[model samples]
Target: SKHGLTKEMTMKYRMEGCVDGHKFVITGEGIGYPFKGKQAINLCVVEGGPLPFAEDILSAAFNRVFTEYPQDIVDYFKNSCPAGYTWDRSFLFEDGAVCICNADITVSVEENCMYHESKFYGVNFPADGPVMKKMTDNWEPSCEKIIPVPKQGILKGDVSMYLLLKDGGRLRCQFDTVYKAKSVPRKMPDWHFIQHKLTREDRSDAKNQKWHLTEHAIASGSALP
Candidate 1:
């Protein structure tokens, strides 16, 4: 889910269709549903009409996912916007939501932020999921990785794992959330939108993670929606 990764990584993505009627496909390196262990900008609507441009191609495929998580989603919406001619007035903007995982867009989910999708997906949401309550970064024992992690296990939704190191010896990294992971800040400003299968309730009371790290941890850090 983040650099807190304990190894075993194998995400995926890819999509097509633009006859104007909107028929796209993404989620090759983006699968783990039941959706919500982290990494979900979900817009899996069925017959919904250019479906909010699928959050503009899922935030441009989460910024070509090469890390720098699109500069913390462009400094978390330009620092939750409103510095001038703003949009939704960031602060991790929200309209209304509470769905959870999908029952085919049940009823609620108006314009959500469920604490900005539970702190942009490092997972664990509630109390409107406000950036993991803006953590002060506890959980010690952090080795490091955009690459150097072998395998661990705790986060689970659908689990599609990976590993291959031939190109340069070892490099099978993947991610999208952690209050602040893999970001990029070059000037992203196209903005987008979404809802949910209802989240921010008992996101398994996350932030106490203890899996296969052979060490202590760091799965609980910065979070302040």
Candidate 2:
């Protein structure tokens, strides 16, 4: 008898996005025989405020996609459309999807512009997995539960996004340009006091870790073969 064993492996990719002037990255990693289709994917917020739920980070990204690109998903056929008016349909307005496999969906940023890609399906969202559920229920990160609203035209700059499909199709999305929205004052949440206390704790922890170790000074290894 011959025995062959596969070692556990991990893979990681980082995605970038901005919400309400907050820039963040959502990191996706998979481990445990990932190449053999037995890997479990994990998502986290690495370079931004400690989000209440890691899944919310990805959700916010997709939500913004919907915001920037208004998909009037009311009618699919022209016969139903009102006379002298067209629906001017949007892309993939009917299909919905969740992340099913490693790298099934990925996001990237270049020149401060956001881009996303999906393989074999629509964009990825929270899959209601156990890990995500746990994160949502008991996220210890000291951050306020802030909901991202559509950006108003108060500030002007380049804001663009593109959604790439595995089938060699790309959808260009516009930001707060040409059209404008009225700015609204943000209201502080009732749990603001608790968040303030935790924020101080986080700063204290950061100070301690800052003196304890210097990142990039210790070379663990590269993520390359």
Model 2 residue runs over 4 Å out of place are 1-8, 34-36, 41-44, 52-225
Give candidates' CA RMSD values in order: 20.1, 22.9
**Clashing pairs in model 2?**
none
Q: Residue-wise lDDT of candidate 2 within 1-225, one digit each (tens)?
A: 001112343334455554334455655444333112233344554566453223321321220111110122211111111111111111221123232111122112222122222111123333452222323221122211212223421212122323333244433333221111122223211111001010111111431210010001010112356
On a 0 to 100 scale, what is the lDDT of residue 85 in model 1? 13
Q: Relative to the true structure, how large is the alpha-carbon lDDT of every model?
A: 0.22, 0.25
Among all candidates shown, the one with the greatest lDDT: 2
| 10 residues in a row with least lDDT, candidate 2 | 210-219
Give the distance in Å from residue 38's predicted Cα in candidate 1 to where it truly belongs.
15
The sequence of per-residue lDDT tens digits that candidate 1 reaches over residues 1-225 is 221121232232222333233343322222221112234333332233323221311231122121222333332322321110111101111212111111000101122111111111111223332222332111221222221111321111111111112232221112222121222223432222111111111111233211110111111113445
